[PDB]
Paper text:
Interferon-γ receptor 2 is a cell-surface receptor that is required for interferon-γ signalling and therefore plays a critical immunoregulatory role in innate and adaptive immunity against viral and also bacterial and protozoal infections. However, to activate this binary complex and activate the JAK/STAT signalization pathway, IFNγ receptor 2 must participate in a ternary complex created by a homodimer of IFNγ, two molecules of receptor 1 and molecule(s) of receptor 2. From its sequence similarity, IFNγ receptor 2 (also known as IFNγ receptor β chain or accessory factor 1, AF-1), has been classified as a member of the class 2 receptor family. It consists of a relatively short 69-amino-acid intracellular domain, a 21-amino-acid transmembrane domain and a 220-amino-acid extracellular domain that is structured into two fibronectin type III domains.
Residue numbers in the entry: 28 to 99, 102 to 220, 223 to 240
The structure:
Amino acid sequence: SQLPAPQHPKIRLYNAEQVLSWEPVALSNSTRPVVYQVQFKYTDSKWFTADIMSIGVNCTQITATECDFTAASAGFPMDFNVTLRLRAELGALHSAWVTMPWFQHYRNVTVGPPENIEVTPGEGSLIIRFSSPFDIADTSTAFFCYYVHYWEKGGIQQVKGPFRSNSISLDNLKPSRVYCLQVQAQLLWNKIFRVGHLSNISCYETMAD
Ligand SMILES: *[C@@H]1O[C@H](CO)[C@@H](O)[C@H](O)[C@H]1NC(C)=O
Ligand SMILES: *[C@@H]1O[C@H](CO)[C@@H](O)[C@H](O)[C@H]1NC(C)=O
Ligand SMILES: *[C@@H]1O[C@H](CO)[C@@H](O)[C@H](O)[C@H]1NC(C)=O
């Protein structure tokens, strides 16, 4: 015998976040809570159970309707090919497995804006500093390139980049003028690029002297 399977499962891959979510399976009002089990496979490996010792988080017999793989070190290596599966359970009864499309985090990720954008005005310059959208420890596998879009109000937009640094100088600017700008990252991976979201517009006046 068989329970109904969870509907509309989704995988969120945003910056460093990895979260599987799904809609609850509700049986009769009188039934005790349904629980869920998540498993994962690396290409053609065994089906691993998503538990603290296999991936860093406990998504076995949970009542919650999500498995956040990076909530605690935890999570899938970003170049690993991963297939997730999910089911509902009530004791020894369970649903069929719902199997997700495979992903690789670098292939499938949505890249957010650089954060902590800090601008130090100079006489004819603005120095722009910011944090990467997320940390990539192995620099030889993947890296970010950055672009700054900037303009005077009502002017035509200019673009500087790409550059690898987390600091960039906009030079040869007019003194005592307001420049508005947005920073954007592009992720490069040697198997692919992802274009990141633009930061919010912020505006700075260059120094007089
Ligand atoms: C990822 O692995 C799946 C099988 O689990 C395979 O069908 C797919 O082609 C693989 N993707 C890549 C990019 O190797
Ligand atoms: C995993 O989390 C659930 C939710 O509290 C808990 O009941 C279950 O026994 C946990 N299993 C382990 C091995 O920690
Ligand atoms: C990841 O990207 C590839 C497109 O290159 C696609 O085949 C695959 O279905 C995507 N996976 C997910 C889970 O979005």
